[PDB]
Every structure is written in C-alpha cells, then in structure tokens.
C-alpha cells in the first residue's frame, strides 16, 4: 500500500527533460505517460549532459516491457547483432562461420 | 524520438 | 558475394553439429525453420551449446528477436537497477535525488 | 526450443 514515486503523469517532455536535467547522478529517472502514443508509457533516464527517452509499452494482459530496435531485412539484423548481444544476460556477439 | 525505437 | 551465414532450410541437428565443430562464441547461421514454415531461426554457438533465437515478425513484417516482459510496472524498474535500460549504454535507474 | 520464448 504505497504508490509509485517515479510515476509524474503526463508530464511533457520538457519538464521531464528540464527536471532530470537538474540531477547529479546518472539514472536519474521518471515514468511518464507518452504525448507520442495513448496507452504507452515513456521512461525518461538522465545520463552525462543529455536526457535519453526509452519506449514502455503495456500489451493487452497487463505485461510490462521496453521497446526493442525493428529491422527490415534479416542481413540488418544479423548486422546488428555484430555488436549489439543477442542475448539478455550472456555477452554473445555474432561471428562469421570459419574454415 | 526514443533511443529504443 | 552471397551472405555465407544463411544455410536456408536444413535440419535443427545439422546446424547444431555444424556449429559445435566451430571454435569461437559468435558462430552463427540463419536457418529456415522447418517446425514453424515461413519463420527464420538464429542458431548461434557458446561455450560447449548451440542457442536457438526464433527470427520474429510484427505487424509491420518488421524482424526482431523478441522483448522482455515483466508482471508489473515497479518489476521493470527495479529489475533495469542491475541491468542496464539501454543494451548500447551503460544505464543504470537510479532514485530522483530530492 | 528457443531461447527468447518461454
């Protein structure tokens, strides 16, 4: 029985910006709900001297989770997946078959 | 414009 | 010229056994499922295994290998404490400083 | 199976 102190609403971007901005550490963070798509939730997270936005969707049994990057073509996301790991906790980057 | 999209 | 990583449609054991015979993490190819006609599967190797990732399609016929879903709002919160929000950067969510 | 379905 405690709300959720992180949670600002609807704030605008720029007041989630101009506020985390004002902050001393990094992950300085809100959830606000998105201006871009109704349902959808925006996590805005402070890092160096920039504030970054990361997409929070809501599917239709209540399930949480973040946005991930959407390719056109199998070669861009084999590509992609060269430096980025395919795996959640596991660092495993794709290399090319040898001999 | 997010980072993840 | 062709990608020498897309093998198209051969058996599960066969990119396994191919696979286990590299040496190095990271050795992958796309194969054509046979199990689910029509999906792309990600065989890749680590350590003394052979991963599988199932290639995915939304509703736009863009490709991806999935998300990670979570029972509630403060669950993602938390959990994206110890793991970085971003898999490019380092970082962590820390509490608004009042 | 697959790693990334549970």
Known sequence: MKPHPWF??????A???EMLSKQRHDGAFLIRESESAPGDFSLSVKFGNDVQHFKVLRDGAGKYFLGVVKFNSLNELVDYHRSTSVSRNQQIFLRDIEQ | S???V
């Open chain 2, 2 to 4: 997010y980072v993840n």
């Open chain 1, 8 to 13: 600002f609403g609807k704030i605008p971007r």
């Open chain 1, 15 to 17: 007041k989630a910006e």
